[PDB]
Amino acid sequence: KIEAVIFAWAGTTVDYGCFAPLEVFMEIFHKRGVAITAEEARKPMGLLKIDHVRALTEMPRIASEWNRVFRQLPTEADIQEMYEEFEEILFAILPRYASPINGVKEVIASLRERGIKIGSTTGYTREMMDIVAKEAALQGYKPDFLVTPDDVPAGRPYPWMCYKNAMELGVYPMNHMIKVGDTVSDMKEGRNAGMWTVGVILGSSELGLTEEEVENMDSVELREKIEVVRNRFVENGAHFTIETMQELESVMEHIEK
Amino acid sequence: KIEAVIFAWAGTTVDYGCFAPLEVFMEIFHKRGVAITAEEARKPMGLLKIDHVRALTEMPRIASEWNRVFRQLPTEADIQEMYEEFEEILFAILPRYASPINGVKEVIASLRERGIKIGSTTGYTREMMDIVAKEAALQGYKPDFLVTPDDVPAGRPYPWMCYKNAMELGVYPMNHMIKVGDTVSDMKEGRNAGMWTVGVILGSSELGLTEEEVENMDSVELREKIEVVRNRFVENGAHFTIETMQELESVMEHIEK
Numbered sequence: 428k429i430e431a432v433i434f435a436w437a438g439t440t441v442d443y444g445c446f447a448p449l450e451v452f453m454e455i456f457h458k459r460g461v462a463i464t465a466e467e468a469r470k471p472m473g474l475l476k477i478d479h480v481r482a483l484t485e486m487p488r489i490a491s492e493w494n495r496v497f498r499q500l501p502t503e504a505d506i507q508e509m510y511e512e513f514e515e516i517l518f519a520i521l522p523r524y525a526s527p528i529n530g531v532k533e534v535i536a537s538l539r540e541r542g543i544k545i546g547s548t549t550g551y552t553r554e555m556m557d558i559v560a561k562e563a564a565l566q567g568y569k570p571d572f573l574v575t576p577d578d579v580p581a582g583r584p585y586p587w588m589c590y591k592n593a594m595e596l597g598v599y600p601m602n603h604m605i606k607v608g609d610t611v612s613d614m615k616e617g618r619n620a621g622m623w624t625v626g627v628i629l630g631s632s633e634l635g636l637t638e639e640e641v642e643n644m645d646s647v648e649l650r651e652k653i654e655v656v657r658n659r660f661v662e663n664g665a666h667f668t669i670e671t672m673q674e675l676e677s678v679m680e681h682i683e684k
Numbered sequence: 685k686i687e688a689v690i691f692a693w694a695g696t697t698v699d700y701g702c703f704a705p706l707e708v709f710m711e712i713f714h715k716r717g718v719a720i721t722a723e724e725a726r727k728p729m730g731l732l733k734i735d736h737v738r739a740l741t742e743m744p745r746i747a748s749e750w751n752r753v754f755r756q757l758p759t760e761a762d763i764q765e766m767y768e769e770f771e772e773i774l775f776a777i778l779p780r781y782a783s784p785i786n787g788v789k790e791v792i793a794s795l796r797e798r799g800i801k802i803g804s805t806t807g808y809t810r811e812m813m814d815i816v817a818k819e820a821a822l823q824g825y826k827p828d829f830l831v832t833p834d835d836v837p838a839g840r841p842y843p844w845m846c847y848k849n850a851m852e853l854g855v856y857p858m859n860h861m862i863k864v865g866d867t868v869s870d871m872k873e874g875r876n877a878g879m880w881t882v883g884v885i886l887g888s889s890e891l892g893l894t895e896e897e898v899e900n901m902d903s904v905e906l907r908e909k910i911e912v913v914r915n916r917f918v919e920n921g922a923h924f925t926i927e928t929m930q931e932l933e934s935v936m937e938h939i940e941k
């Protein structure tokens with residue numbers, strides 16, 4: 428019996444394609460000569476934003492530039508400074524990226540009718556979530572609980588946020604819970620948490636596509652991109668992979684049998 | 685691979701036979717004119733002390749008698765009142781019951797040599813543990829971390845405290861941890877938390893015998909009560925049972941395969 432589902436936020440319940448952080452991540456590196464790609468900017472998506480900045484400076488290709496430019500590799504000063512700007516730019520647009528993804532609300536309402544708790548973990552800080560959650564609620568979305576990396580010792584890939592969700596929801600064991608995410612870090616989080624782990628494809632950070640891009644992309648080109656994402660989720664621990672949240676119910680039924 | 689081991693306190697690491705509260709639970713019920721057996725007083729051993737008193741007033745036999753004497757079932761005021769008496773008495777003699785069991789420290793140090801994290805959960809309140817922890821640490825025992833029901837939403841059999849241990853000890857998944865306990869509620873905590881659950885017999889609250897009673901007893905009767913406890917632990921989820929802590933190491937190595 429699955430008693431609770433723990434949802435990721437960006438790329439899973441709100442912000443289709445997880446675009447809020449994408450342009451900001453590139454902006455803070457561009458202003459210094461390092462032109463990171465969208466694909467690199469998306470690789471560590473899901474972890475705490477500051478950890479994400481660090482992960483980017485860690486990547487060989489990104490560290491390669493920086494060193495050759497500033498004549499030295501990134502230091503804790505360079506990370507903290509860019510993250511600082513990340514926040515200033517992020518906070519101004521953040522209210523715009525809290526729109527519940529297309530069919531998530533109906534799935535949430537469906538899970539509640541059945542008495543399934545609605546938990547959630549995040550890559551955003553608490554300060555960011557006061558904005559995201561308030562704005563999302565205005566738009567019709569508010570989970571039963573919400574834990575940010577600020578509430579536990581560390582964010583993803585660690586299962587700490589998931590454990591806190593369980594405590595406050597009163598659900599045990601962990602296998603009585605499903606974790607639904609859209610990034611590679613969400614999958615590692617679910618598995619490290621010992622919970623049934625699901626990956627959403629459309630609207631995910633891993634696809635990196637906007638709604639319009641999905642609706643207008645060549646059908647074959649899309650599927651090709653969908654399988655790449657599905658395979659990525661699988662290689663990274665996903666027990667299940669769903670194209671949209673509309674299949675969540677099916678995964679739940681499968682698990683219970 | 686087992687990365688950490690969580691131990692119960694009274695009856696597992698310290699206070700052989702778990703006698704510290706036994707006569708207290710008995711004293712507070714006898715005062716009200718409702719006598720309770722040692723077996724009854726021990727059945728819910730492990731739960732947060734206050735929860736333990738509520739569990740006693742919950743037991744059909746005890747509830748029946750109270751209804752006979754007072755013409756009503758125990759009130760929250762009664763439980764609250766009894767618990768106030770439980771503390772006043774328990775505190776005065778707590779220090780005397782916080783001494784490590786014969787050969788536990790040996791296994792403990794042997795585990796630390798193998799790079800193993802040592803966590804702990806309890807039924808004693810934080811305030812209560814301050815006394816036990818300080819005194820226990822004076823006699824050679826001090827785990828890497830300790831959690832009480834005051835730290836989480838509820839104590840045993842809930843797995844909350846264990847998750848806290850997991851968070852703070854940076855270990856995951858839960859099955860990379862072993863829960864070592866001596867009560868039924870300890871077995872339930874381990875299983876509820878998704879970890880390797882092991883019950884210790886000699887010195888457990890489930891045995892209820894002191895060291896002298898164990899040695900001064902016939903080898904037929906001892907191997908009779910040990911089998912009762914062993915069967916109790918197992919029927920309650922224990923994966924493995926050990927007569928003494930010196931068998932833990934083997935259980936681990938067994939699990940590694």
Ligand SMILES: [Mg+2]
Binds near residue numbers: 436472550609613
């Ligand atoms: Mg996510």
Ligand SMILES: [Mg+2]
Binds near residue numbers: 695696729866
């Ligand atoms: Mg115990």
